[PDB]
């Protein structure tokens, strides 16, 4: 986590710049829990570093009452002789997603532990993830293509709130301020975005005519 002084000094000695690995950030809002977990688990075994955000907005098919009961049946499984060192029942929606992915990995191998350690899960979109780059989706695991809309579904955050997750209102307030801040910055920079769109229009009159013909042939003008 926090870098050692040896690591920081070697960076000074090496003179290298800031480094960030190739990390995929997935917006898990309106994603099927087990379909997204199966897709992510295969990618982790393929050497991918993956961050998943908005784990509180994952979906499970069925009513919220039946999915709450399915967790309460999971919660009732514990080592009677010693409940410590028994199964650990995590309530956070990101912890539910990580446990689901872990069960789709060979967790008892050094290779399956490497894959699991490449996954970072969050509720909402934390500040260190907001500006890192464009978030992605899994089209084959999205709710609007996976469920018939007549059937009820549950949001993972609402189900988790009633089984022992205490930070539902904290994430709700933090997410409210995130969109409020992001929409203020998106209302700004509209002049910059419109100025670039009009420059690409004005460029078409300045650039060579035969290059505009090539642009039209391939559908870029």
């Amino acid at each position: 986590a926090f870098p050692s002084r040896k690591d920081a000094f070697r960076a000074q000695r090496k003179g290298a710049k800031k480094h960030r690995p190739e990390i995929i950030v997935i917006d898990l809002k309106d994603h099927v829990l087990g379909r997204a977990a199966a897709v992510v688990a295969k990618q982790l075994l393929l050497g991918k570093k993956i961050t998943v955000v908005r784990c509180e907005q994952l979906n499970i098919a069925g009513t919220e009452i039946r999915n709450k009961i399915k967790y309460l049946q999971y919660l009732r499984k514990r080592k009677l002789t010693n409940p410590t060192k028994g199964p650990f029942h995590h309530r956070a929606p990101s912890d539910v997603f990580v446990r689901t992915v872990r069960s789709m990995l060979p967790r008892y191998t050094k290779r399956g532990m490497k894959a699991l350690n490449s996954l970072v899960a969050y509720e909402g979109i934390p500040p260190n993830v907001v500006r890192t780059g464009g978030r992605v989706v899994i089209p084959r695991a999205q709710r609007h293509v996976c469920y018939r809309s007549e059937r009820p579904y549950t949001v993972l955050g609402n189900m988790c709130k009633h089984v022992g997750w205490k930070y539902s209102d904290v994430v709700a307030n933090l997410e409210k301020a995130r969109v409020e801040k992001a929409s203020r910055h998106h209302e700004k920079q509209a002049k910059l975005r419109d100025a670039w769109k009009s420059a690409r229009k004005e460029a078409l009159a300045k650039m060579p005519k035969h290059n505009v013909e090539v642009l039209k042939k391939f559908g870029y003008a």
Partner: protein
């Protein structure tokens, strides 16, 4: 929009060997199939299409169910649906996608210098506008600092240090 599946509706084939081709619904079998045909395409004789493989368009010719081939040919020509469709932006995108698929290494290069020439002149146009009214980060930052720095450099002590260390250069 969502255009209704009706007799006379123009559709585009989504996938399969007839992908990106255009036909007319002509007849509806059930909830899953239709009888598409297009007289002006050689590969689009009357055939059964699954309704998952079609994309309804905004054009609808005036035909009845199970119309003759001659009736559809006259309706398609008079309605000018194919001429109107070819002028749309999504029709030009399908043609451009076909041009990119068969493009050689030379045409891939020619497109690359065309998009670089357009990008170069967009940068030149943006620089002209940016100088006039600041909209980029560095020009907005400069306009916020120009007033404060003028106040700080208007002093005699600032003016003297500037003169002394400019003459040293």
């Amino acid at each position: 929009k969502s255009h209704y599946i009706c007799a006379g509706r123009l559709v585009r084939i989504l996938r399969g060997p007839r992908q990106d081709r255009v036909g007319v619904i002509v007849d509806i079998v059930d909830a899953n199939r239709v009888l598409v045909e297009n007289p002006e395409d050689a590969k689009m004789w009357r055939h059964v299409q699954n309704l998952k493989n079609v994309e309804p368009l905004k054009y609808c010719v005036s035909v009845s169910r199970n119309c003759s081939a001659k009736a559809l040919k006259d309706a398609l020509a008079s309605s000018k649906a194919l001429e109107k469709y070819a002028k749309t932006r999504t029709a030009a995108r399908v043609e451009a996608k076909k041009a990119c698929a068969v493009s050689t290494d030379f045409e891939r290069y020619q497109l690359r210098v065309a998009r670089r020439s357009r990008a170069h002149w967009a940068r030149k146009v943006f620089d002209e506008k940016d100088a006039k009214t600041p909209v980029s980060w560095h020009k907005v930052a400069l306009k916020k600092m120009l007033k404060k720095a003028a106040k700080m450099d208007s002093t005699e002590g600032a003016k003297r240090r500037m003169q002394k260390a400019i003459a040293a250069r």
